């Protein structure tokens, strides 16, 4: 039933002689810009006057204001925060978007809210990666890719689909798989992962730490076991490949497997499933959308306070103590986004 | 304060002219054996007559029964399942362990239950890695390592500490850090991660999947979001480096950060931390030890049924469908454990 594109279902032919304007040079923008350039696609970056403008210049990109980038582009990727879409679309994009040009968003939220809208004579699409920037870039350089969902919202040209999938191939998403999914469903899925799953996973790791520390366990050891060692991370990432219960079957001692299966499906009270439903209601009904616009109206002042408050929590105090005392294995990220060969 | 050993705090000098018997060639045994050999340490494998014996032979090791390996070793690493420690210790190890030899376990359970005990004239220690085999081997080959906890239980020789830490350096654990921790605390801590945290994390991922599917979301998309994409896994592994809240701050869109910080610290009712306490009580009070021994009866037949049942849960049915339709980034594992 599902429509999933891999390398055999896309080509770079539709990008021959075309310029892509990458609007934004943040988590997504930098990854798209780097992968597109290395794939032999003509890229220019449109960015406001901030640290990202200078980074784009530092990493060898042709950088201008947003309006000028859009004016000289056949394809425009709008890779800036979703609350900024409305103003940038109205002022910078819509007036400068050429006849037959394609506009892409990496998240359906601005489409659901009507902040980005179809324009006569132009194509509108969602190409939404299921991964953040650093892994999109590392996977690409390894001849691999992150998954993505796509939706052709408007297709005046009749060539929107092949151009979207050509971008997807150039950035490496088709090496994993690019699946058709409506922008509205993508929005709700995406916000659910960020508002229920991620907070609940960290809350669970934190609960583990807090209980162990209170029961007289060495705080450094407690932190390492609940995530600091990387073991829980490796389980979840290896789990993505072969399956979560399968990782336990293959890599777990009999003691570990017996323990795991004793409590598997018995740890959570019904209230967690009930909360998941409540979070979806806030996301679908407009409650979250209103909450977000209030938080954005102050240049995310509340968010800055929350971020600084989070670093004071015992879990993050213990993290700093563990990281100073134990060396964690990491790859050098220095030249990660500088020019490379097509893999 | 905490006693943490790195490469500057250990050497391979104590292993000069010493033979290490790796007892078992499973998840830990294979990684210990491979890393010790590549570090220029003399290694022997002691194993019962099963697939692991043939694998050890296939990967170029000297392989014998457990009794023979122990008899020809200055250091013995007991890397077999914990319920098998008692019988192997009494029949195969204790009668054959040389004067001034060192016995190491990688988990304190058999020490707590008194299935492995101090022997006159001999050293007994725990060196417990905080990671499973494949990552320990990949890390080692990249000039890296995983953390470990160690405990010198009996030191007749007076040289147990430097011999245990020499093993830790040879296998690569000192590249991360090797911290002193009591075998009793290690036991309870290790079982807590396996019995509360790991089940609770998968239970939560499964709850996310089952709610999305129930609400009419694309099952493949639902599965990908809750872990299948690798995004949740990458967050947790990157989080080990820089902190979980910090990953969100660095890698999250403003929309993501606002959503995250709305429910952060508010998702779990008090009942979750209460169940965590109950799991620890079972681990500390002997309830789990009794359960494990019952489960070990008839070569873990109950566990075999649980493993087969797990593969048929909606989550794992959806995983197989996703993994068939979406290619995941993997690294070649062929000859990962062959000589470097
Ligand atoms: N974070 C991710 O990994 C990720 C994943 C998939 C989808 N997305 C989507 O990609 C888009 C970009 O998100 P991101 O995480 O890269 O964001 P980010 O916070 O990294 O964005 C920074 C970029 O946005 C620009 N910017 C910020 N405020 C602006 C404004 N008012 N006007 C113009 N430009 C402004 C900055 O100059 C910079 O180039 C969003 O639609 C988001 O939902 C992000
Ligand atoms: N699994 C891990 O990654 C991990 C991590 C840290 C600590 N440990 C500890 O390492 C030890 C070994 O665990 P593992 O995960 O490698 O186990 P495993 O399931 O991989 O063990 C298989 C090995 O044990 C041998 N074996 C099995 N039953 C035996 C028996 N009755 N008598 C003799 N040999 C027998 C097999 O021949 C084989 O060599 C345990 O004490 C465990 O707690 C394991
Ligand atoms: O680290 C441990 O203890 C594991 C085990 O199987 O015992 C790998 C999980
Ligand atoms: O910040 C975002 O929006 C993420 C996404 O995948 O949508 C990275 C989490
Ligand atoms: Mg997402
Ligand atoms: Mg998002
Ligand atoms: Mg264990
Ligand atoms: Mg462990």
Author numbering:
A (entry chain B): 2 to 344
B (entry chain A): 2 to 341
Paste lines from the article.
A trait of BP bacteria is a conserved gene cluster coding for the biosynthesis of polyketides (malleicyprols) with a reactive cyclopropanol unit that is critical for virulence. We show that BurG, an unusual NAD+-dependent member of the ketol-acid reductoisomerase family, constructs the strained cyclopropanol ring. A sequence similarity search using BLAST predicted that BurG belongs to the family of ketol-acid reductoisomerases (KARIs; EC 1.1.1.86), well-characterized enzymes that play key roles in the biosynthesis of branched-chain amino acids. Biochemical assays and a suite of eight crystal structures of native and mutated BurG with bound analogues and inhibitors provide snapshots of each step of the complex reaction mechanism, involving a concealed oxidoreduction and a C–S bond cleavage.
We raised crystals of holo-BurG in the absence or presence of 7 as surrogate and solved the structures at a resolution of 1.8 Å and 1.9 Å, respectively. The head region (C1–C3) of all co-crystallized ligands was consistently found to be firmly locked in a conserved binding mode that is facilitated by interactions with the two Mg2+ ions of the enzyme (e for unliganded holo structure).
